[PDB]
């Protein structure tokens, strides 16, 4: 049985980055050559694993995380990076074992006058731990005065919209991201390439 990579890569709609999606993959045969030999992806960088060995490796579980960001932020989806997306939305671990796949989606995720479905967290008083997902909407207290849950001066709503317009520069255009995580536990590996089946 193959792995349902099409559900993740070829999904109709993607999640906002602050509420990034995660799909568990197990008990299937994966064909990573379909992905590395695609040229549809502008970004395909692996960490802690080498890409050409993937078809000959097994793992206990593979997690695919999917979300949308803008072009200038694709570089933040890497270990050790900082910035608004890596600090407040989606953080990779320093010891990351997996791959980061991205591609431009300006045609799917833009609307004339702005597509506002895709949001990001702009304010947070602490950085995320790796793979932490914060979907709360508390008012962010920028000063010393309690905000009482009321938006206002020094009391920011923490989320903001990308507002993807098809006329934005490539840096401000939507990019779909899929992060694969290769997890190897003391348990029978169930996700293998075609060669290790």
């Amino acid at each position: 049985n193959l792995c349902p990579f099409g559900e993740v890569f070829n999904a109709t709609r993607f999640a906002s980055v602050y509420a990034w999606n995660r799909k568990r993959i197990s008990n299937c045969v994966a064909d990573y050559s379909v992905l590395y030999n695609s040229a549809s992806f502008s970004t395909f960088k692996c960490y802690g694993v080498s890409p050409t060995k993937l078809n000959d490796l097994c793992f206990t579980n593979v997690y695919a995380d999917s979300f949308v960001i803008r072009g200038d932020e694709v570089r933040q989806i890497a270990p050790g990076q900082t910035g608004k997306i890596a600090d407040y939305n989606y953080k990779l671990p320093d010891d990351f074992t997996g791959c980061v796949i991205a591609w431009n989606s300006n045609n799917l995720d833009s609307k004339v006058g702005g597509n506002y479905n895709y949001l990001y967290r702009l304010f947070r008083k602490s950085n995320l731990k790796p793979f932490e997902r914060d979907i709360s909407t508390e008012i962010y207290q920028a000063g010393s005065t309690p905000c009482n849950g009321v938006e206002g001066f020094n009391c920011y709503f923490p989320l903001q919209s990308y507002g993807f317009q098809p006329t934005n520069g490539v840096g401000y255009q939507p990019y779909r991201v899929v992060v694969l995580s290769f997890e190897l536990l003391h348990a029978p590996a169930t996700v293998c390439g075609p060669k290790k089946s």
Partner: antibody, heavy 123, light 107 residues
């Protein structure tokens, strides 16, 4: 671009409630959020609240919290403002607005406005 | 809080003249400053955002300038329709409206 058409004027008794509608004639609002701004006769503009339709979350100003409910039906491209426990001080014109934000500034400015809805409260 | 002060409350200028309206912020709002025009009996409309960027369809005789705490709205040749109330509004740290300037016909 965006055309905002509001419901008609209302004469209401104290203690009652009113619900004002605001329809985007384009089939969409094309904004992150939609605010309601009120103006008492001869006075300036006071922000009351906004709804973020994507999240279904509404933020209200302190002066009306508990008395006001802002909603948005995505199917009909219509925002609503329901003010209750009406007092005579609520006599004002109420405008709906599409909000626009410029990162990293945290405030909205209002690039499109409905025509306004007069709400007279009197015994 | 950011306090927005408009001066003067009433600006009496004759038709076809230049009009200059002042908006002062009690602390810096950078260029996150908007101007609205409210004609009699009508809803406000956006004239300027970003301190100096005209909203779409706004004619070039309206222009804004300033950054920080001192802003101005200039009308290069007053037209009968331009006699109205004008509001500035910061949106740097949430929002604050100015009190309004009435551009009145000087006679």
């Amino acid at each position: 671009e965006v055309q905002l058409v509001q419901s008609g004027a209302e004469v209401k008794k104290p203690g009652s409630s009113v619900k004002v509608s605001c329809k985007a004639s384009g089939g969409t609002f094309s904004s992150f959020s939609i605010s309601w701004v009120r103006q008492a006769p001869g006075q300036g503009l006071e922000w009351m609240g906004r709804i973020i339709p994507v999240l279904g979350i509404a933020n209200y100003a302190q002066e009306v919290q508990g008395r006001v409910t802002i909603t948005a039906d995505k199917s009909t491209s219509t925002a609503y403002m329901e003010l209750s426990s009406l007092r005579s001080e609520d006599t004002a014109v109420y405008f709906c607005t599409t909000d626009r934000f410029v990162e990293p500034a945290t405030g909205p400015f209002f690039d499109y406005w409905g025509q306004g809805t007069l709400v007279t409260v009197s015994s | 809080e950011i306090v927005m002060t408009q001066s003067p409350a009433t600006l009496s200028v004759s038709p076809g003249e230049r009009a200059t309206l002042s908006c002062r912020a009690s602390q810096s709002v950078s260029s996150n400053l908007a101007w609205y025009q409210q004609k009699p009996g009508q809803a406000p409309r956006l004239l300027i955002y970003g301190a100096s960027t005209r909203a779409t369809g706004i004619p070039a005789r309206f222009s804004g300038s300033g950054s920080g705490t001192e802003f101005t709205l200039t009308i290069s040749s007053l037209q009968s329709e331009d006699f109205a109330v004008y509001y500035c509004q910061q949106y740097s740290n949430w929002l604050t409206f100015g009190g309004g300037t009435k551009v009145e016909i000087k006679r």
